[PDB]
Amino acid sequence: XXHXXXX
Amino acid sequence: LVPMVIEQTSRGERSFDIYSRLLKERVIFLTGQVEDHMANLIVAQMLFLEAENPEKDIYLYINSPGGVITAGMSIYDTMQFIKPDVSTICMGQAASMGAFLLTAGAKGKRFCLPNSRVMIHQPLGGYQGQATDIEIHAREILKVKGRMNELMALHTGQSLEQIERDTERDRFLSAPEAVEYGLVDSILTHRN
Amino acid sequence: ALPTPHEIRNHLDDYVIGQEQAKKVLAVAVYNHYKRLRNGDTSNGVELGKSNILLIGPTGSGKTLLAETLARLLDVPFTMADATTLTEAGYVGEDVENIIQKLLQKSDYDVQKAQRGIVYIDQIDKISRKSDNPSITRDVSGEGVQQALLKLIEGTVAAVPPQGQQEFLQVDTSKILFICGGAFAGLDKVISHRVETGSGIGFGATVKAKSDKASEGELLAQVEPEDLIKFGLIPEFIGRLPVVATLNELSEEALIQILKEPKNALTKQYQALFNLEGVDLEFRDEALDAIAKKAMARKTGARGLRSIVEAALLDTMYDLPSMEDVEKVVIDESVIDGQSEPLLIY
Amino acid sequence: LPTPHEIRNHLDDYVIGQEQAKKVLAVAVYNHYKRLRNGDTSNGVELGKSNILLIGPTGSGKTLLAETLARLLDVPFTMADATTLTEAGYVGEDVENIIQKLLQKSDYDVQKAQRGIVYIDQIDKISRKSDNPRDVSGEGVQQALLKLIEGTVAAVPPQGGRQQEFLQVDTSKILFICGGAFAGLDKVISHRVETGSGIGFGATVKAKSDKASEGELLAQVEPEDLIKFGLIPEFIGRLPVVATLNELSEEALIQILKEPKNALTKQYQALFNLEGVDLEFRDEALDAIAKKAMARKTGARGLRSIVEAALLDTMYDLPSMEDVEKVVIDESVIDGQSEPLLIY
Numbered sequence: 001x002x003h004x005x006x007x
Numbered sequence: 008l009v010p011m012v013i014e015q016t017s018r019g020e021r022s023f024d025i026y027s028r029l030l031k032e033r034v035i036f037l038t039g040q041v042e043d044h045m046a047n048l049i050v051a052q053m054l055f056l057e058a059e060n061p062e063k064d065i066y067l068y069i070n071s072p073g074g075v076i077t078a079g080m081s082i083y084d085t086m087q088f089i090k091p092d093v094s095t096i097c098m099g100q101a102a103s104m105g106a107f108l109l110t111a112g113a114k115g116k117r118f119c120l121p122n123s124r125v126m127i128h129q130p131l132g133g134y135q136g137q138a139t140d141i142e143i144h145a146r147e148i149l150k151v152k153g154r155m156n157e158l159m160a161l162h163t164g165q166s167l168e169q170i171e172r173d174t175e176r177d178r179f180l181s182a183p184e185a186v187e188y189g190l191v192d193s194i195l196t197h198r199n
Numbered sequence: 200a201l202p203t204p205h206e207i208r209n210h211l212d213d214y215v216i217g218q219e220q221a222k223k224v225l226a227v228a229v230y231n232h233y234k235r236l237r238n239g240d241t242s243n244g245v246e247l248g249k250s251n252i253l254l255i256g257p258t259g260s261g262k263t264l265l266a267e268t269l270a271r272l273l274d275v276p277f278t279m280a281d282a283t284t285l286t287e288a289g290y291v292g293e294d295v296e297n298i299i300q301k302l303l304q305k306s307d308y309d310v311q312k313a314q315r316g317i318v319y320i321d322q323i324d325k326i327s328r329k330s331d332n333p334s335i336t337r338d339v340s341g342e343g344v345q346q347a348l349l350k351l352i353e354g355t356v357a358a359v360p361p362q363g364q365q366e367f368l369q370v371d372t373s374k375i376l377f378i379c380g381g382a383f384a385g386l387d388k389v390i391s392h393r394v395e396t397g398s399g400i401g402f403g404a405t406v407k408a409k410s411d412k413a414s415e416g417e418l419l420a421q422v423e424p425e426d427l428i429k430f431g432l433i434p435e436f437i438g439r440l441p442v443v444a445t446l447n448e449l450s451e452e453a454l455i456q457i458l459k460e461p462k463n464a465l466t467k468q469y470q471a472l473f474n475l476e477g478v479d480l481e482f483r484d485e486a487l488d489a490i491a492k493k494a495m496a497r498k499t500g501a502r503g504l505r506s507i508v509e510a511a512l513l514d515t516m517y518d519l520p521s522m523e524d525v526e527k528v529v530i531d532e533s534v535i536d537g538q539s540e541p542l543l544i545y
Numbered sequence: 546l547p548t549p550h551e552i553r554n555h556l557d558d559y560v561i562g563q564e565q566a567k568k569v570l571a572v573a574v575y576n577h578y579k580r581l582r583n584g585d586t587s588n589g590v591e592l593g594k595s596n597i598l599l600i601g602p603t604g605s606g607k608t609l610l611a612e613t614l615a616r617l618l619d620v621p622f623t624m625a626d627a628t629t630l631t632e633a634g635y636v637g638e639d640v641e642n643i644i645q646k647l648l649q650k651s652d653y654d655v656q657k658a659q660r661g662i663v664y665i666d667q668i669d670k671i672s673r674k675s676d677n678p679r680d681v682s683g684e685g686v687q688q689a690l691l692k693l694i695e696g697t698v699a700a701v702p703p704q705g706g707r708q709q710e711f712l713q714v715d716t717s718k719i720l721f722i723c724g725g726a727f728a729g730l731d732k733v734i735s736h737r738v739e740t741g742s743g744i745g746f747g748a749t750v751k752a753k754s755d756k757a758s759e760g761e762l763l764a765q766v767e768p769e770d771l772i773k774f775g776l777i778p779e780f781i782g783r784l785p786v787v788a789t790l791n792e793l794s795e796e797a798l799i800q801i802l803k804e805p806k807n808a809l810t811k812q813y814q815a816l817f818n819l820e821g822v823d824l825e826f827r828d829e830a831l832d833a834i835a836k837k838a839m840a841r842k843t844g845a846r847g848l849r850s851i852v853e854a855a856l857l858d859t860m861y862d863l864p865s866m867e868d869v870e871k872v873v874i875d876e877s878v879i880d881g882q883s884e885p886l887l888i889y
């Protein structure tokens with residue numbers, strides 16, 4: 001569905 | 008040599024010196040003779056703690072045989088200018104100028120050790136030259152002696168006539184006598 | 200005829216207290232909206248302007264209450280949307296257009312009646328960037344929804360599904376009002392940076408805090424649009440909202456008035472709860488002021504007041520059903536502290 | 546048919562404060578149509594494409610120029626948005642839809658649609674920010690738009706079909722006006738060129754002065770600066786013409802409140818006239834308003850805040866008040882220190 005990207 | 012200590016924090020370990028570690032907790036050390044260089048360092052410390060927190064009391068440990076008068080008066084005005092209450096403690100000895108900064112602390116937050124000793128006398132000086140110059144410098148040091156007695160009475164509560172009679176010569180006062188004299192508030196015998 | 204500003208404020212006073220600055224702002228907009236809707240696109244000056252309100256206040260100040268009470272007295276349609284579910288760039292979840300489709304349920308599919316409607320949003324602060332002008336990961340509710348909303352406020356037409364042919368309808372927003380307001384968090388830190396100008400160490404450095412400075416009400420009053428740029432809002436979004444309302448923190452006196460004067464004041468609600476049980480409940484004046492002092496310490500607003508009352512009467516509520524032949528119950532100031540127990544009347 | 550002298554005067558009637566920008570648009574608009582009059586028939590081969598790149602602050606009139614130009618120009622005009630644009634059309638929109646709306650304005654006239662104008666607002670929205678990635682509004686949108694801007698024939702069902710056929714409408718002839726507010730661009734240009742921070746006695750330091758940061762900085766913009774912003778270099782290469790707009794001056798603000806027919810004073814006084822009381826504003830109040838507006842740095846769009854907040858108290862109690870023939874507003878009312886005095 002959506003997008004997730006982090007660190 | 009100065010030992011190094013480690014302060015544990017959430018981010019990580021940080022190595023700090025003993026003197027700097029205690030400074031973080033609003034603690035300043037007054038050691039040795041009172042001179043222009045050591046006095047200028049303490050003034051910066053008081054100002055630094057005021058900005059960090061103006062509602063926390065400052066603790067000033069004094070162990071010194073005294074020194075220059077003009078260097079010490081800068082510390083007295085600084086303690087009164089800042090809002091925080093500058094707590095004072097007597098360790099080892101408190102000479103003429105060391106005693107004035109001790110009694111200059113916040114009322115009710117002054118303590119003396121059970122074996123500490125305080126000494127008070129009149130200002131010391133001297134000059135060599137023409138008679139006209141001696142009169143100028145003599146009137147000046149007389150003003151300081153009068154000024155130092157007025158402030159001593161203000162904090163100790165005694166009368167101006169009593170301080171003059173007691174400061175004509177060296178006068179040693181034990182820790183119990185300092186309480187009766189209004190110089191301090193209590194004694195920190197043991198931890199509670 | 201149309202309602203007057205003084206008449207609508209007298210109605211709001213029954214449900215709201217201590218927000219005189221905010222009541223006048225909403226009154227002029229409603230008056231302006233009806234005046235704009237009074238003439239049939241005929242006026243001395245063509246291209247009548249649209250003004251958008253930006254409600255800003257502390258937590259529990261009464262922002263959500265005004266939008267609810269406004270719809271009761273408002274004749275034209277009203278909707279209560281939320282910015283939490285807005286999905287910019289058509290991602291999963293609700294979309295900006297949904298706000299328009301929701302406005303038809305209250306208007307019953309009436310385009311001419313819907314264009315004259317009012318819109319209210321909440322939690323608008325939540326969609327602001329994290330005090331950073333350039334967005335690194337294309338925030339969906341940051342650098343996204345805020346931009347998406349610009350088109351609606353500016354005035355455009357969006358297709359909306361008529362029912363749940365399959366053709367769509369177009370409805371303009373140029374003559375529709377929007378009230379976007381939310382309690383901003385951390386705004387006081389930014390305002391302090393630009394207005395205190397006294398930070399530093401030194402004899403001549405004005406550093407006095409926790410006693411006089413850093414007041415929540417005063418800081419908000421001095422707010423300007425340039426200050427919101429450092430917070431995260433885009434200037435374009437702020438440009439569409441010229442009007443700004445700065446509410447204040449509830450005062451001690453305000454709490455006492457809110458306890459009794461409102462129609463749905465907590466004191467009255469508990470009395471109603473006790474009334475059905477058959478035991479009357481009375482609050483002694485002295486006791487009421489004590490509760491107000493505790494509420495301010497919590498710094499939770501009017502909503503937090505319930506906590507104090509619940510704890511004070513927690514024990515009595517438990518023992519009231521099992522007890523019998525009780526006609527009246529009196530609460531004292533000591534009961535609020537918890538040291539003493541309230542007296543009972545048989 | 547196009548005239549650069551007259552077109553500048555026409556835009557002046559509806560737009561004020563941007564004189565240099567009007568000259569740039571007149572040249573590109575004239576050159577673009579002149580090219581189509583004799584298409585690739587001159588001796589000069591590989592003629593550069595004539596496009597427009599609007600760049601200015603908020604409330605500078607970017608959206609206004611597109612509206613005024615559409616009214617003055619005879620060919621159909623369109624006003625699209627980049628936020629709605631999405632790649633591979635999942636649920637948002639498709640790039641081809643932009644051509645469909647153009648035909649609705651042109652009434653399915655391919656000969657009349659190819660000579661149309663295109664204006665896309667919020668060009669910065671499509672900036673490629675894919676640091677943490679799929680991306681539907683980033684590279685995908687710019688890639689599709691660049692393909693269209695390059696000039697290609699795209700299938701468009703005429704009227705939707707009652708057929709399985711599509712028309713191959715050209716795109717190189719159609720003009721495009723990419724414009725939007727660039728936030729953070731000034732910092733990028735300032736980062737590249739500062740020429741300061743001199744600690745020597747001879748060296749000079751400018752802390753407040755920023756060498757007309759609002760206008761001069763834009764004038765010295767380069768394509769390489771936009772590359773760091775997120776745009777593709779090929780996209781900027783296709784637009785040799787860039788328009789720079791300076792911040793509105795206090796003098797311009799006064800003109801905007803008097804000359805236009807959409808002036809705040811004209812509409813507000815008209816609103817008051819409906820109530821039955823005339824509204825009067827002195828010249829001293831106008832210049833005072835300009836100073837406050839420039840401080841906000843919100844552009845013309847934020848001008849209304851000062852005027853409305855100042856009149857909040859007056860309008861609140863004006864209906865209850867009676868026997869007031871006229872309203873007089875002094876310069877102090879703008880500050881808010883003194884309340885306005887009514888006339889009976």
Ligand SMILES: Nc1ncnc2c1ncn2[C@@H]1O[C@H](COP(=O)(O)OP(=O)(O)OP(O)(O)=S)[C@@H](O)[C@H]1O
Nearest residue numbers: 215216257258259260261262263264382457501502
């Ligand atoms: N001015 C007021 N007068 C009386 N009661 C108030 C007032 N403001 C708040 N309240 C009470 O607080 C409740 C909640 O008010 P809200 O409108 O939600 O405040 P709020 O500022 O909107 O909080 P947020 O924005 O949702 S965090 C109301 O139902 C009232 O009981």
Ligand SMILES: Nc1ncnc2c1ncn2[C@@H]1O[C@H](COP(=O)(O)OP(=O)(O)OP(O)(O)=S)[C@@H](O)[C@H]1O
Nearest residue numbers: 560561602603604605606607608609726801845846
């Ligand atoms: N250059 C200008 N001259 C006069 N009035 C202006 C000008 N720019 C903006 N305005 C006023 O502001 C209103 C809206 O202007 P817009 O062009 O929508 O602002 P904008 O910043 O160009 O919009 P964006 O940023 O492209 S979405 C107009 O109807 C005018 O009343």
